[PDB]
Design a protein around this ligand. Structure first.
Ligand SMILES: [Mg+2]
Ligand SMILES: [Mg+2]
Ligand SMILES: [Mg+2]
Ligand SMILES: [Mg+2]
Ligand SMILES: [Mg+2]
Ligand SMILES: [Mg+2]
Ligand SMILES: [Mg+2]
Ligand SMILES: [Mg+2]
Ligand SMILES: [Mg+2]
Ligand SMILES: [Mg+2]
Ligand SMILES: [Mg+2]
Ligand SMILES: [Mg+2]
Ligand SMILES: [Mg+2]
Ligand SMILES: [Mg+2]
Ligand SMILES: [Mg+2]
Ligand SMILES: [Mg+2]
Lengths: 206, 56, 141, 63, 145, 56, 63, 143, 70, 55
RNA sequence: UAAUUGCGAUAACGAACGAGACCUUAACCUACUAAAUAGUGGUGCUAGCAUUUGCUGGUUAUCCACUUCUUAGAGGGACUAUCGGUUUCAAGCCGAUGGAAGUUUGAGGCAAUAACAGGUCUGUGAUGCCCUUAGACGUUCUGGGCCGCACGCGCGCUACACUGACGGAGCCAGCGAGUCUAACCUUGGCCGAGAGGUCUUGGUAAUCUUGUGAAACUCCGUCGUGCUGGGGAUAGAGCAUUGUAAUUAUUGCUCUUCAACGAGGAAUUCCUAGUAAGCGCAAGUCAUCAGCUUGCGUUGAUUACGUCCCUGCCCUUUGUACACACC
């Protein structure tokens, strides 16, 4: 890879991978394809990044929320619940860990497992509250692809945050533990349960 | 002297505050219109803008 | 007297000023090398200019930086900007236009607010709440 | 939303009214024209008037 | 640090100072459960006793244990600061004391009764089962006794 | 009959949990003065629009 | 599980009393030329892809 | 190549310098160590037992090396943390004047610092000498 | 204060023969084996690393990751 | 300051500000022009100070 | 359209107050005018490490040059521009590129006619009238009270912890303020665990406090789910500080005591981007006392970009026996 050294030194593992491939902390943004229909154009993965922290403004326009990296979007939704508002550094660290933990289990790409876990927990359709007067029934509507991702994310995070309460197990562990099961739904995870149970009710009015 | 520039300009302002007041309670019968203060060495000039100056 | 340029970058309230002269390619910030920084969770953030443009290109130039104001994260985005801008400020007065515009092509294709200074800024809080938008609690009766 | 006030549109009408000569589809030079040709108390105001004289000009060229 | 083994020597729940002490919890914090010793106090005394802080309560060969008994009820002869102790200047013999275990329960009542026997307002306050520290009692303190 | 213990065993008067009591809001716009000034006495002070010509 | 893939054709209007629902017409990428209007949940633009958990049915008005 | 302490990163400089003053024994540790809380803003004394004066001194050294002149009051403010006032909100509070000042004297007698003009303390010419030393010896662990 | 705080020579060998087949090993992982409270866990990690049997892929406080010897 | 004299009403505050501009120029001059330049070029309400020498 | 903002329809045409313009503040200037009270480069003087030229500092004036960073005068800039979608191809709207900036650029200030028996006689030597005026409802001094405690209501603060406490250590802002006939902001050196004490020093302030090294946050460890080392109520005992005075404990420090609270029912507040929320700082108040307020910067999300369902309020239409106008 034609190593280059100058006055203030840049280390080997640093020099090498960086210029070669644009990949993650160290994980490949290549491969990692969205295994489901729709859900593409709503999951980012190329353009690749280094760390999940970014100063970009996705809030000034409607759908540009989606153009954000789906790994980052996972991190953002981590930092919340009061005390953890802010603290991207807290989350971004946990994320990199979670990837290391997912990577340990069944190999593949932690970043791809993220994709699988998200695409698998998205509700296909759901029920709103339509008044109809007085006692209100539930109309089955099919959820938008954009909301489908968003929902998956908050679902996973919530489910891990709740499992990570009052137990020795850490966030990066519970997050991984969720993402691992959410990759191919085992119905052992908070999200897969709730997603499908929204679709069970969506099918119970139709 | 020995003041801050800050406390000066504020306290200067208050000076014009009390000044204009004193004249307004005095020369109203003369049609007092307000005042101005000119800061110079050797002198401090105050000019009465009252409409009827024959009574001032 | 050797060929040299000076730039800056500003994120939030932070300002990073950087001198680019011709050198054997030391890259330093304040007193320490670019290899330290720390926050360090973001360490790769400020490396990014050295990456997009290739780890060479710095061998004929020394880069020194210093960061005042802002905050822990805010400065980091400002230094990298002063870095990438300074590298493209050096091809402005010295090297070539065609290489220069192949540099802003290498940056802005990807970027993250790189040659472009981020325009966001704290909004003044007004009375009626603890925050800018946020109001106080009212109980009615 | 961005909707020019009456005073902009009213000024702009009269402008195109007495000067079609000069006054191209370029705002920039129309702006420069304004300072020479018209008396406006503010930079901001003048541009809003030039922007719209240009917008009306642009659509006169077709119909 | 290292991986310890021992044999059968470690015991759970050793009793001292007229109270009970969990053996399998760290000794710095183990001692605290005694009335009159807190985290700080336990901290200083254990260090003084030439005891390894990494050790647990179930550890600590008997001599080390009994040593700790001495330093606690006799802090001043063992060179402890005298501002580090709860009862100092006393009210009577003027001596600085560190009152411990079941004995600290008494030295509350003694004091309370002093101000009560004297009929001082602070005392009067206590006897009424009120907040004595001159705090507003209108909104706060509803459940209580 | 002194100290917390006594009062604790006592029942709390129900004027403790009561309302605002209002007392004369909906009567506001109605003048209780019984007086009501008169049209002449008004036009003396403020003039009447019938004489405006001789005002101007 | 008879999976059904549909591409949003046009954006129609906001139904529902709350307004969360948005009417839209779609097209299947398996055997196109048949268009059916469906009810969404979240935000929606043109050329999106909806997953219908059953093929043939539709609603119209919501309260 | 040549070395400055600026080449060594933050923490790992001070860890090594700590082991250095430790390995030495020329310290002047006041002796009220282990009984002291290092700030009013703190719950517990430092966990190091025998130690941590080395950490602070070594920290103190590096800081004064970094800059022109530093005083006690600046160390009180720097090392100071956020005291919880209990049920009342947090506020920043200064660390102990004695620990820090006694650190400056303990190092001055040892000769890593000298009382500077204008105020405060300046890093001694022999301070830089033995700071850059062990600084370079840190890079010999990673060589 | 429920088990897992002490050495118990039978626990030592318990670790030694049970660490293989662990794809994931950590502080929390060691507690899930019905043993090894947190203090002794973080010591156990360093001493399993003394010779082989675990490869640190991780770094620090709040997260520990080790994998089977190869 | 709160606008209202009393306590009634929503809590409206008001921020009054006064703006102080300070300018200083350096000159090397004889005894005449300084004394000639200082009496005149005066203004009603602009503070003018002439400090002397280096110390 | 945020707008009686416009377009269009038109017995109307063309107008003015209000909205808009305007004003301030936050954004953009390697282009103009400059700076030892802002700052960079080069050189003398000068220290450390490496030596092959290097790397990292000191030196209120040892000089020379400069204005990128700082500063504020004067100008420039945006006018939703270019192009393209959609619409009476009208005002507009939306998307994309460029751009410091395209949500009225963000945020404020100003803000017509009119209404209320809204609040304020307890801000006023603004005031009608009433009351009182020497045993005073004037005024002053002493002590007490506004804090009193079975309880109901409201704004907050701190917590229930492992996105954590704790111990080391990395160490980063902005808006302010600061002493003359004076004791304000306070660096530094000593003494002290701390609180603080003492000798001095800079500063009427871009000059000194002060880079306000603030906090959250980042790192390495100790703790391991157990009301535990989470939490700090309550209370005992001692030392300090403000003030003539601290008892009903002004605040500050140290030890000990170690409560309730294991995510909170019916209800209900606030909010759409550097916003929310988490965090500390400065200012007002201030001899002493912030859990308050007014500003400030730090870290920085999830979710809308819609509808009239709830609520609230405008607008017509319609009724009227109200016009002191449904009190
Ligand atoms: Mg205890
Ligand atoms: Mg600090
Ligand atoms: Mg600290
Ligand atoms: Mg400039
Ligand atoms: Mg763009
Ligand atoms: Mg009334
Ligand atoms: Mg009044
Ligand atoms: Mg009161
Ligand atoms: Mg900490
Ligand atoms: Mg003492
Ligand atoms: Mg406890
Ligand atoms: Mg605690
Ligand atoms: Mg909750
Ligand atoms: Mg204050
Ligand atoms: Mg108040
Ligand atoms: Mg009618």
């Amino acid at each position: 890879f034609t190593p280059v050294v100058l006055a203030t030194p840049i280390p080997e593992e640093v020099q090498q991978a960086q210029t070669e491939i644009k990949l993650f902390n160290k994980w490949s943004f290549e491969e990692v394809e969205v295994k489901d229909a729709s859900l593409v154009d709503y999951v980012q993965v190329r353009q690749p990044i280094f760390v999940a922290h970014t100063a970009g403004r996705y809030a000034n326009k409607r759908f540009r929320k989606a153009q954000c990296p789906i790994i980052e979007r996972l991190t953002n939704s981590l930092m919340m619940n009061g005390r953890n508002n802010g603290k991207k550094l807290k989350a971004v660290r946990i994320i990199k860990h979670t990837l290391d933990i997912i990577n340990v289990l069944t190999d593949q790409n932690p970043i791809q497992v993220v994709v699988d876990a998200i695409t698998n927990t998205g509700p296909r359709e759901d029920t709103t509250r339509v008044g109809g007067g007085g006692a209100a029934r539930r109309q089955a509507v099919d959820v938008s692809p954009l909301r489908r991702v968003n929902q998956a994310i908050a679902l996973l995070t919530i489910g891990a945050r709740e499992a990570a309460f009052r137990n020795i197990k850490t966030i990066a562990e519970t997050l991984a533990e969720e993402l691992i099961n959410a990759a191919k739904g085992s119905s052992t995870s908070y999200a897969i349960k709730k997603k499908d149970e929204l679709e069970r009710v969506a099918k119970s009015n139709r | 002297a020995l003041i801050s520039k800050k406390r000066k300009l504020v306290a200067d302002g208050v000076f014009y505050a009390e000044l204009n007041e004193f004249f307004t309670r005095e020369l109203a019968e003369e049609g007092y219109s307000g005042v101005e203060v000119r800061v110079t060495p050797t002198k401090t000039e105050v000019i009465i803008r009252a409409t009827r100056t024959q009574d001032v | 007297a050797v060929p040299s340029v000076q730039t800056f970058g500003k994120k939030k309230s932070a300002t990073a000023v950087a001198h680019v002269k011709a050198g054997k390619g030391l890259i330093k910030v304040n007193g320490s090398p670019i290899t330290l920084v720390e926050p360090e969770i973001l360490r790769f953030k400020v490396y990014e200019p050295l990456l997009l443009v290739g780890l060479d290109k710095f061998s004929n130039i020394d880069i020194r930086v210093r960061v005042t104001g802002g905050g822990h994260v805010s400065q980091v985005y400002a230094i990298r900007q002063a870095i990438a801008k300074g590298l493209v400020a050096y091809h402005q007065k010295y090297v070539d236009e065609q290489s220069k515009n192949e540099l802003k092509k290498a940056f802005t294709s990807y970027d993250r607010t790189l040659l472009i200074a981020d325009s966001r800024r704290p909004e003044p809080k007004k009375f009626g709440g603890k925050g800018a938008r946020s109001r106080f609690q009212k109980s009615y009766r | 939303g961005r909707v020019r006030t009456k005073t902009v549109k009213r000024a702009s009408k009269a402008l195109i009214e007495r000067y079609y000569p000069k006054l191209t589809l370029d705002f920039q030079t129309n702006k420069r024209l304004c300072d020479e040709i018209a008396t406006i108390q503010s930079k901001r105001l003048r541009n809003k008037i030039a922007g719209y004289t240009t917008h009306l000009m642009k659509r006169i060229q077709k119909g | 640090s290292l991986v310890v083994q021992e044999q059968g020597s470690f015991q759970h729940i050793l009793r001292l100072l007229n109270t009970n002490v969990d053996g399998n919890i760290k000794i710095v914090y183990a001692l605290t459960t005694i009335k009159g010793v807190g985290r700080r106090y336990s901290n200083l005394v254990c260090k003084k006793a030439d005891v390894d802080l990494h050790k647990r309560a179930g550890e600590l060969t008997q001599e080390e244990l009994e040593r700790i008994v001495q330093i606690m009820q006799n802090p001043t002869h063992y060179k402890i600061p005298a501002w580090f102790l709860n009862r100092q200047n006393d009210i009577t013999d003027g001596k600085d004391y560190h009152t411990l275990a079941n004995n600290v329960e008494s030295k509350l009542r003694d004091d309370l009764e002093r101000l009560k026997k004297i009929r001082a307002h602070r005392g009067i306050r206590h006897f009424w089962g009120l907040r004595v520290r001159g705090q507003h009692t209108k909104t706060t303190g509803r459940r209580r006794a | 009959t002194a100290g917390r213990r006594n009062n604790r065993s006592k029942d709390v008067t129900d004027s403790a949990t009561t309302k605002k009591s209002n007392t004369r809001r909906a009567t506001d716009r109605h003048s209780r003065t019984g007086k009501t000034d008169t049209k002449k006495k008004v036009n003396q002070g403020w003039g009447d629009d019938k004489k405006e010509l001789s005002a101007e | 599980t008879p999976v059904t893939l549909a591409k949003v054709i046009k954006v129609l209007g906001r139904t529902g009393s709350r307004g969360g629902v948005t009417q839209v017409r779609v097209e299947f990428l398996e055997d196109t030329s048949r268009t059916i209007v469906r009810n969404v949940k979240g935000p929606v633009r043109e050329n999106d892809i909806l997953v219908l958990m059953e093929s043939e049915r539709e609603a119209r008005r919501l309260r | 190549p040549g070395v400055s302490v600026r080449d060594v990163a933050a923490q790992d400089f001070i860890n090594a310098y700590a082991s250095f003053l430790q390995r030495q024994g020329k310290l002047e540790v006041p002796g009220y160590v282990d009984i002291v809380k290092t700030s009013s803003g703190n719950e517990m004394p430092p966990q190091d037992a025998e130690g941590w004066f080395y950490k602070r001194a070594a920290s103190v050294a590096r800081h004064i090396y970094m800059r022109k002149q530093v005083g006690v009051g600046k160390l009180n403010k720097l090392y100071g943390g956020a005291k919880s006032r209990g049920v009342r909100p947090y506020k920043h509070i200064d660390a102990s004047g004695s620990i820090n000042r006694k650190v400056l004297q303990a190092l001055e007698k040892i000769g890593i610092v000298e009382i500077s003009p204008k105020g405060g303390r300046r890093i001694s010419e022999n301070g830089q000498r033995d700071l850059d030393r062990i600084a370079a010896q840190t890079l010999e662990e990673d060589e | 204060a429920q088990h897992a705080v002490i050495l118990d020579q039978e626990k030592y060998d318990r670790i030694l023969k049970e660490v293989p087949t662990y794809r994931y090993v950590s502080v929390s992982v060691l507690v899930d084996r019905l043993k090894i409270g947190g203090s002794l866990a973080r010591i156990a990690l360093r001493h399993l690393e003394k010779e082989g049997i675990i490869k640190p892929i991780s770094k620090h406080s709040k997260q520990a990751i080790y994998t089977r010897a190869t | 300051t709160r606008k209202t004299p009393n306590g009634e009403g929503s809590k409206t505050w008001e921020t009054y500000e006064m703006r102080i501009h300070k300018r200083y120029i350096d000159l090397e001059a004889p005894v005449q022009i300084v004394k000639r330049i200082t009496q005149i070029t005066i203004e009603p309400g602009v503070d003018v100070e002439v400090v002397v020498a280096s110390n």
